[PDB]
Design a protein around this ligand. Structure first.
Ligand code: MG
Ligand code: MG
Ligand code: MG
Ligand code: MG
Ligand code: MG
Ligand code: MG
Ligand code: MG
Ligand code: MG
Ligand code: MG
Ligand code: MG
Ligand code: MG
Ligand code: MG
Ligand code: MG
Ligand code: MG
Ligand code: MG
Ligand code: MG
Ligand code: MG
Ligand code: MG
Ligand code: MG
Ligand code: MG
Ligand code: MG
Ligand code: MG
Ligand code: MG
Lengths: 206, 55, 63, 145, 61, 142, 143, 56, 69
RNA sequence: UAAUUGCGAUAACGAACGAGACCUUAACCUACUAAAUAGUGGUGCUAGCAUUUGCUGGUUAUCCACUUCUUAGAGGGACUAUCGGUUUCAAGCCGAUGGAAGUUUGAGGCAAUAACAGGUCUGUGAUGCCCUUAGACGUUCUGGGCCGCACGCGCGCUACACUGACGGAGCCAGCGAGUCUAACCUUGGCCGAGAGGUCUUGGUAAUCUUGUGAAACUCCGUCGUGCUGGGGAUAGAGCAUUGUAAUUAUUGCUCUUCAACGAGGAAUUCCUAGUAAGCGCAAGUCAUCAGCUUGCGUUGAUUACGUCCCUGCCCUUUGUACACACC
C-alpha cells in the first residue's frame, strides 16, 4: 500500500486500512446492496464514512434526512429515553459493538445486516386515523418509502431498548439480536411483530 | 429585574445593561508635552487617568 | 402473494381532516401503461416507489 | 485469575452477631445485613482483618470470621478512627462506642427515651410521632406510616 | 416569507423610471449607483431596494 | 532563519483550533502530543480523515502544530480536523502550485463534513418564561 | 528517538509509573490510605486500596510535568467530581487536600517534584528524566 | 478614592440622577430642564439649563 | 439463583462447552450455564490462557469473543 | 404574506400610525488601524528525551519581527444572489448551484388606535378621602410568629437502575463577578478523613482568583437483576462553619437507621435545529441557607415541513328584541 513514513509514526493498520479503501469502522462499504427496491435512494450506503458521528444538518430542509447514512440514522435513534439523550458517543460505541457481534454470528456484512433489517420491517401499508363517523373506523393507506425507513428504526430500536432493560444483556447485544431477527425476519423480532401487525390492520378495514 | 411593581400577572423580565469601554495609549514626552496632553484632550463622559511609571 | 411497485408522477394534495394523508399519482413501474390515484400516510416525494398491497381499490378524498 | 473451586470449604449461610449473614454475597456487602455495619465500616474492618476482599462471605475460615468480629466490636483498637463510629463521645460515660447488632435498636430507644424523660421539645416530637428536624408538615409527610 | 414592502417597491418604480439607462441587470453595480443618485439611510434598505429594481430588470428586458 | 510556515484555524461551536504548517519532516501534533493519541477515542478516525482524503504523502513535507482552546470534548475534535484540512490548502496556496490545491479542495469537499467550511450553528439564548431556548415552563390554568 | 511522556498514552502511561512506584517501595504512603475516599464528594473509598495512591501519585507527576506549576488546590478540584447530595441536585465538590498534599510532599522526597516560584510544584529535572525514562519503556512495549 | 471602574461609572450614574432630581425639585419655578457634569482635572463642572436662569 | 464459586464439575462444563459457541460474552455464560457474571469475567480472562477463545474487540462495556482456532 | 405584507381587481385618488424600516445580539473578513493587561514565530538564557539536525519544556518582558488565532474601532458582506420548476407566467412559493450566512439570516429590544372598575395605597418624602395619633394603628426593645398539620390542589427535586451504580484514570467551556477610608473575589505554603483551620499572596481587575482543570462525558475495573452495591427519605451520635443568638435540627462533614419507589389511573404540560432533552457553571437573593429565577455554555438527537378534526383568535357573511352589550 506504499507504507509512507513521516516524523510522527502513524500505524500500519491505520495507513493501509484507509488510504486504499475507505471502509467503515473497518467494514466494507462497497458490495453491499439494498435487497429491496423502492427503499433505495433512502437507505444511504453509497457514500462511505469512518465513524457513525457527523456534524450533520438534516433538519433544515424537509428531504435531507435521507442523505444522512442509514447507519448514523440507526445510531442516532438509539440515544433516546431522557437519561440517554445526547449521548451520541455511547451509541457509536454500542453500534460498533452491535456490528462486530453480528459479523461474528452469521458472517456476511453487518452493514448489509443492518440494511437487510431496516427494509423487512417498514410497514408497506398502515391504518390512518379517520373521523370514521363516531366510532372512528380505520382507513387503509400505504406508507411513504421515507416512513418505511423512519418507523423502522423507531420500531427496531424500541425493540432493543425494551429488551435489555431489566435484562443482563447490553444494548449492543439485544441490538445485534434485534437486527438479526429482522435482517431475516425470524418473526421472533419485536419489529417484525410490529410490522406484520400494522399491515395486518390495513389489510382488514379497507 | 421584573417589569412589574409587585407580582401581578405574567412574569415578564426586562434586562438592562451598561457598556463600559476602556482603552489605553502609551506616550513618552518631557515637561510641557505632559500637562498639555492631559487637558487639551478632554470631553465630558470621558474619564482620563495619566500614570507616572515603574511600580 | 403479489406485490405492486408504483413510481410517483404528480402530487395531488393533502386529505384527511387532520391533514393526515397525501395524494399522489403513481406510474405502475413494471406496467408503464397504467397510472392510478393513491393515498399516502408518510411524506412522499416525486419519483419514489410506493408498495401497494391491493392493486385495484383507488379511492379519493378523506377526513 | 480467581478460577478456584473449593470443595467443602464453601459453606453458605453462617451466623454472626445474632444475624443471618448470607455466604455467597461479597464479603464487604455480606456483612452489612447487621443493624450497625454498613458499606464503609464493613469495607474497613475486612481491611484490618487481613481478608482478601475479592472473595465472598461463603469462604473465610472461622479464623477470618472471629478476626473480623473481634475487630468490629472493639474497632478503636485496630487503627480505626473514632469518627468512623456511630456513637462517639456518649452522654453517660463519655467514651467512644460503635453499637452494633441488637445494640443499635437499643441505644436508639434509650436516647429517644433519654430526652423523653426530660420532656424537651425534640423529645415530644418523638412521643407524638412527628418530625423532629423542624421541617414542613403542612404539605408533606402525608399518607402517614 | 419574503415579501418586500412598498417603501422598497415604491423606490424601485422610481429609480427604474428616473434612471433606466444607468441601471443594469446586475445587483452589484446598481448598489453602487444607489449611493449616488439616492440617499438610503441603511445599508439593508439600500441593498433590498437595489435587489428589487434588479428583479424588475430581468423581467423588464 | 525563520522557516516557510502557514497558519490556519478551524472553529466549531466555542472551540478554536489554531494551526501551524511549516516546511518539515512530517510530524502532526495537537497540543504537544502526536495526532495518533487524540483520546476522545471513538472519534479517532475523525481527525485522521484529513490525512486519508488526500494522500499520506502530502504531509511528509510539513510539520503541523495544533492547539485547541474552548468548546468541549467533541467540538475540539471537529475543530482540529478542520484547522488541519485548511492548513494543507493554505500551504499549497502560498508555497506550491494551484491545481493540486483544488484537487485537494476537490477530495475534501467531495466528502466535506465542515472540513474547510466552518459550521456556523450556535447556541440559542434562553428566554424568560422557560428553562430552555424554546421550551416554556409548565402552565397549569385552573 | 527522543520520547516525552506526551508521546505516551496517558492511561497506559499512568498505569505503568504507578507500578514503577510500588516496585520501588520508597514512595511514602501516609498512615491512613485504607480509610479515605479521596474527596468529600465520593461515596466509597478507592477499591484497589493497595495502589490508588500510586496511580494518584503517578498521574500527578505526569500532570505537573505537562505544565508550569500546579498547587494542591488545583489538584483538589481536578480529582474532585460530582456529589450526590441526596434528594437534591448534583454539583462539583473539590477533593481531599491532605491526600494530594502528602502526594506532593512525598514526591518531593523522591525528587520527582519540588517547590517553585509562582507557588505550587514544578517538575524536577530528576523527575523530568524519571518520567521521560519510564515513558520510553512503555513506548517500546512491542517486544 | 480608588474604586472599581465597574462601580465607578455606575456610582457616577447614581450621582447624576440624584443631582438631576434635586435640581428638578429645588429649581421649580425656574423651569429647569436637565444638567450635565464635566468632571475636570481640578474642579468639577455642573451645568444647569433653565428658562429662568436669572433666578438661578 | 446462579452460581458464584466454581463447583469443579461446574468447571467441567466450561472447558467442554465454550468452544461450542462462536459468541461468548458476559451474558452468554450467564444464560446457558449459571455463572454469577462476576466469575464470568475472570472466566473470560481465564479462557484467554492459551487461546481457548480469541478476542477481536476488548472493551470495558462489552466482551466480543468467538470460537477457538 | 409571518403582516392592511403584497399583486392586482377597482369610485376612488393620494396619504399618516402600526407592521416594515430601525436597534441589539450571534454568525463571515490571511483587507485597514493597533497590541507587555491578547497571542504567535525566531532567538538569547536553561531542563529533559535523542544524540543525526530533532521532540518536548522552562525563563514576565534577553533581544527582534509580526497580527493567523484574541479583543474592538473603521468598513466591506446578502439582495432570499445565479439557474431552473412554477403561478394572472403578477406578487410570490418550491428545487438545484454557489455563499459564513438564504426559516422576518437565527434570537431578542421597540411597538399604533381603543379597552379593563385586571394588579399594585405593602416601592416611593407619589396622592385624595377615611381612620388613628402619647392605654398610639407612631415607634423602638425583649420573646414568640410567619415553617404551626387528620387533609384537598399547583410548581418542582430525586428516582425506580446494566444506554446503570460505584472506584480509579482521562479532562473540555461560556455567560459572569470581586476590598476605602475597608475586610471583598482569594491562589498558595502548612494543618485537617472531612467539613474546615492557620500563614502568607494576587487583584479597584483582558494583568490576580481563573485555562474559573464544571458536570454530563471518555476509559480501564468492580458489582451482576437480587426492592441488590438501584433509591436516599426518616432517625441517633459526633466534628465544624455563619452569626449577638441555631432549640422549632441555618448550612457544611463522617458513621450509623436503608423508608416509599418494579414505569405510574382518568387526565395533562412543553416543544421543529445546535432545537427538544440530559449537563453543570456564574448571576440575582445572600452574615448564613437553592431543590427557585435571570443567563451561559458542554453533549445533542426522533418527528412536521402539514392541517382545521379538538381548543382558541382573525376576517367576512347572516341573525339580533343585546348597547350596563349572553356575567
Ligand atoms: Mg448495616
Ligand atoms: Mg449510635
Ligand atoms: Mg431563562
Ligand atoms: Mg441552554
Ligand atoms: Mg474535573
Ligand atoms: Mg473523575
Ligand atoms: Mg441524588
Ligand atoms: Mg444532574
Ligand atoms: Mg398599508
Ligand atoms: Mg412606520
Ligand atoms: Mg507579549
Ligand atoms: Mg517567545
Ligand atoms: Mg450548498
Ligand atoms: Mg381593580
Ligand atoms: Mg411585600
Ligand atoms: Mg410559577
Ligand atoms: Mg448510591
Ligand atoms: Mg465515572
Ligand atoms: Mg440498597
Ligand atoms: Mg447514606
Ligand atoms: Mg449564590
Ligand atoms: Mg424566589
Ligand atoms: Mg330577520
Amino acid at each position: 500500500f506504499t507504507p509512507v513514513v513521516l516524523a510522527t509514526p502513524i500505524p500500519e493498520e491505520v495507513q493501509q486500512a484507509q488510504t486504499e479503501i475507505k471502509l467503515f469502522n473497518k467494514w466494507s462499504f462497497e458490495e453491499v446492496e439494498v435487497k429491496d427496491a423502492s427503499l433505495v435512494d433512502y437507505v444511504q450506503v453509497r457514500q462511505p464514512i469512518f465513524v457513525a458521528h457527523t456534524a450533520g444538518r438534516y433538519a433544515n430542509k424537509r428531504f435531507r434526512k435521507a442523505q444522512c447514512p442509514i447507519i448514523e440514522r440507526l445510531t442516532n435513534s438509539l440515544m433516546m429515553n431522557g437519561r440517554n439523550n445526547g449521548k451520541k458517543l455511547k451509541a457509536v460505541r454500542i453500534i460498533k459493538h452491535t456490528l462486530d457481534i453480528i459479523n461474528v454470528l452469521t458472517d456476511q456484512n453487518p452493514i448489509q445486516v443492518v440494511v437487510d433489517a431496516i427494509t423487512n420491517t417498514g410497514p408497506r401499508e398502515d391504518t390512518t386515523r379517520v373521523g370514521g363517523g363516531g366510532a372512528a373506523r380505520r382507513q387503509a393507506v400505504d406508507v411513504s418509502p421515507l416512513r418505511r425507513v423512519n418507523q423502522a428504526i423507531a420500531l427496531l430500536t424500541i425493540g432493543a431498548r425494551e429488551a435489555a432493560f431489566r435484562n443482563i444483556k447490553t444494548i449492543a447485544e439485544t441490538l445485534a439480536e434485534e437486527l438479526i431477527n429482522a435482517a431475516k425476519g425470524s418473526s421472533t423480532s419485536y419489529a417484525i411483530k410490529k410490522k406484520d401487525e400494522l399491515e395486518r390492520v390495513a389489510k382488514s378495514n379497507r | 429585574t421584573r417589569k412589574t411593581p409587585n407580582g401581578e400577572g405574567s412574569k415578564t423580565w426586562e434586562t438592562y445593561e451598561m457598556r463600559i469601554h476602556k482603552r489605553y495609549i502609551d506616550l513618552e514626552a518631557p515637561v510641557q508635552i505632559v500637562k498639555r496632553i492631559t487637558q487639551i484632550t478632554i470631553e465630558p463622559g470621558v474619564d482620563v487617568e495619566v500614570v507616572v511609571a515603574s511600580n | 402473494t403479489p406485490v405492486t411497485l408504483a413510481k410517483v408522477i404528480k402530487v395531488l394534495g393533502r386529505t384527511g381532516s387532520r391533514g393526515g394523508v397525501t395524494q399522489v399519482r403513481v406510474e405502475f413501474l413494471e406496467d408503464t401503461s397504467r397510472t392510478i390515484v393513491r393515498n399516502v400516510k408518510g411524506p412522499v416525494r416525486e419519483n419514489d416507489i410506493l408498495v401497494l398491497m391491493e392493486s385495484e381499490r383507488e379511492a379519493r378524498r378523506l377526513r | 485469575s480467581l478460577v478456584v473451586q473449593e470443595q467443602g470449604s464453601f459453606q453458605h449461610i453462617l451466623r454472626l452477631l445474632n444475624t443471618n449473614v448470607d455466604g455467597n454475597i461479597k464479603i464487604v456487602y455480606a456483612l452489612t445485613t447487621i443493624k450497625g455495619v454498613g458499606r464503609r465500616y464493613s469495607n474497613l474492618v475486612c481491611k484490618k482483618a487481613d481478608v482478601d476482599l475479592h472473595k465472598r462471605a461463603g469462604e473465610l475460615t472461622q479464623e477470618e470470621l472471629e478476626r473480623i468480629v473481634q475487630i468490629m466490636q472493639n474497632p478503636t483498637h485496630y487503627k480505626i478512627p473514632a469518627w468512623f463510629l456511630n456513637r462517639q463521645n456518649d452522654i453517660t460515660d463519655g467514651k467512644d462506642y460503635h453499637t452494633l447488632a441488637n445494640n443499635v435498636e437499643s441505644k436508639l430507644r434509650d436516647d429517644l427515651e433519654r430526652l423523653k424523660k426530660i420532656r424537651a421539645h425534640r423529645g415530644i416530637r418523638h412521643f407524638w410521632g412527628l418530625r423532629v428536624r423542624g421541617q414542613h408538615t403542612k404539605t408533606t409527610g402525608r399518607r402517614r406510616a | 416569507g419574503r415579501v418586500r414592502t412598498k417603501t422598497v417597491k415604491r423606490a424601485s418604480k422610481a429609480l427604474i423610471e428616473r434612471y433606466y439607462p444607468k441601471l443594469t441587470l446586475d445587483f452589484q453595480t446598481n448598489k453602487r449607483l444607489c449611493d449616488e443618485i439616492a440617499t438610503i439611510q441603511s445599508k439593508r434598505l439600500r441593498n433590498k431596494i437595489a435587489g428589487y429594481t434588479t428583479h424588475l430588470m430581468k423581467r423588464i428586458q | 532563519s525563520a522557516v516557510p510556515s502557514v497558519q490556519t484555524f478551524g472553529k466549531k461551536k466555542s472551540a478554536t483550533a489554531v494551526a501551524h504548517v511549516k516546511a518539515g519532516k512530517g510530524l502532526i501534533k495537537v497540543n504537544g502530543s502526536p495526532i495518533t493519541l487524540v483520546e476522545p477515542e471513538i472519534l479517532r478516525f475523525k481527525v485522521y480523515e484529513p490525512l486519508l482524503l488526500v494522500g499520506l504523502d502530502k504531509f511528509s513535507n510539513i510539520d503541523i502544530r495544533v492547539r485547541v482552546t474552548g468548546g468541549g470534548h467533541v467540538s475540539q475534535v471537529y475543530a482540529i480536523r478542520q484547522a488541519i484540512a485548511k492548513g494543507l490548502v493554505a500551504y499549497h496556496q502560498k508555497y506550491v502550485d494551484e491545481q493540486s490545491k483544488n484537487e485537494l479542495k476537490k477530495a475534501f469537499t467531495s466528502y466535506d463534513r465542515t472540513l474547510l467550511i466552518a459550521d456556523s450553528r450556535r447556541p440559542e439564548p434562553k428566554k424568560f418564561g422557560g428553562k430552555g431556548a424554546r421550551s416554556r415552563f409548565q402552565k397549569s390554568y385552573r | 528517538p527522543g520520547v516525552s511522556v506526551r508521546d505516551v498514552a496517558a492511561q497506559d502511561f499512568i498505569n505503568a509509573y504507578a507500578s514503577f512506584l510500588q516496585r520501588q517501595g520508597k514512595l511514602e504512603v501516609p498512615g491512613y490510605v485504607d480509610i479515605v475516599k479521596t474527596s468529600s464528594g465520593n461515596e466509597m473509598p478507592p477499591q484497589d486500596a493497595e495502589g490508588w495512591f500510586y496511580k494518584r501519585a503517578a498521574s500527578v507527576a505526569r500532570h505537573i510535568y505537562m505544565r508550569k506549576q500546579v498547587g494542591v488546590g488545583k489538584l483538589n478540584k481536578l480529582y474532585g467530581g460530582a456529589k450526590s447530595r441526596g434528594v437534591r441536585p448534583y454539583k462539583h465538590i473539590d477533593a481531599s487536600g491532605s491526600i494530594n498534599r502528602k502526594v506532593l510532599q512525598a514526591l518531593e522526597k523522591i525528587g520527582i517534584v519540588e517547590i517553585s516560584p509562582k507557588g505550587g510544584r514544578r517538575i524536577s529535572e530528576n523527575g523530568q528524566r524519571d518520567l521521560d525514562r519510564i515513558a520510553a519503556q512503555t513506548l517500546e512495549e512491542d517486544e | 478614592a480608588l474604586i472599581s471602574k465597574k462601580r465607578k461609572l455606575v456610582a457616577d450614574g447614581v450621582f447624576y440622577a440624584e443631582l438631576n432630581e434635586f435640581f428638578t425639585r429645588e429649581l421649580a419655578e425656574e423651569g429647569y430642564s436637565g444638567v450635565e457634569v464635566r468632571v475636570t482635572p481640578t474642579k468639577t463642572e455642573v451645568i444647569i439649563r433653565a428658562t429662568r436662569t436669572q433666578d438661578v | 439463583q446462579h452460581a458464584v464459586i466454581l463447583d469443579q464439575e461446574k468447571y467441567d462444563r466450561i472447558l467442554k462447552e465454550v468452544p461450542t459457541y462462536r459468541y461468548v460474552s458476559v451474558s452468554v455464560l450467564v444464560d446457558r450455564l449459571k455463572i454469577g457474571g462476576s466469575l464470568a469475567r475472570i472466566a473470560l480472562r481465564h479462557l484467554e490462557k492459551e487461546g481457548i477463545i480469541k478476542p477481536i474487540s476488548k472493551h470495558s462495556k462489552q466482551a466480543i469473543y468467538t470460537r477457538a482456532t
